[PDB]
Amino acid sequence: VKFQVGDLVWSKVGTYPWWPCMVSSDPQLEVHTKINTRGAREYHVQFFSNQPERAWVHEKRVREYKGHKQYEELLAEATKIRKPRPQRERAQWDIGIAHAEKALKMTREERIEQYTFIYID
Numbered sequence: 001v002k003f004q005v006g007d008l009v010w011s012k013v014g015t016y017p018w019w020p021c022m023v024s025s026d027p028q029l030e031v032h033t034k035i036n037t038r039g040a041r042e043y044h045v046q047f048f049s050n051q052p053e054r055a056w057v058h059e060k061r062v063r064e065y066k067g068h069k070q071y072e073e074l075l076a077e078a079t080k081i082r083k084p085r086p087q088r089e090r091a092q093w094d095i096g097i098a099h100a101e102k103a104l105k106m107t108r109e110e111r112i113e114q115y116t117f118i119y120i121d
């Protein structure tokens with residue numbers, strides 16, 4: 001366990017670029033971390049965006065969020081070619097980054113109060 005509830009992280013999921021997230025407790029399992037069916041550690045995260053979403057993400061696809069300018073360093077981990085990004089996706093990402101930048105200025109306790117999602121059955 002490297003991350004706790006309220007920690008700001010970048011998550012790399014599916015076809016999406018490294019995305020600003022907050023580690024949170026799964027609403028049903030009541031854990032923020034688990035070992036998956038393949039025996040690997042996963043973290044439960046909230047995606048910062050105008051579209052609220054959550055996911056279990058493999059620990060290898062999670063990085064500590066130190067700031068928005070870290071994005072270049074993440075692309076450099078893959079090792080000049082640059083992938084373009086769609087305008088709609090870039091816009092949601094900019095909203096996510098804006099929230100992440102405000103969250104980074106808060107303590108872990110303030111982030112949890114401000115951003116933890118409300119789940120409705």
Ligand SMILES: Cc1cc(CN)cc(C)c1-c1ncn(C)c1-c1ccncc1
Binds near residue numbers: 013014047049055
């Ligand atoms: C986890 C997840 C679930 C659902 C619902 N089926 C839809 C999407 C797009 C996603 C997602 N996966 C990866 N990212 C980055 C996101 C996401 C979430 C919020 N805003 C923008 C991108």
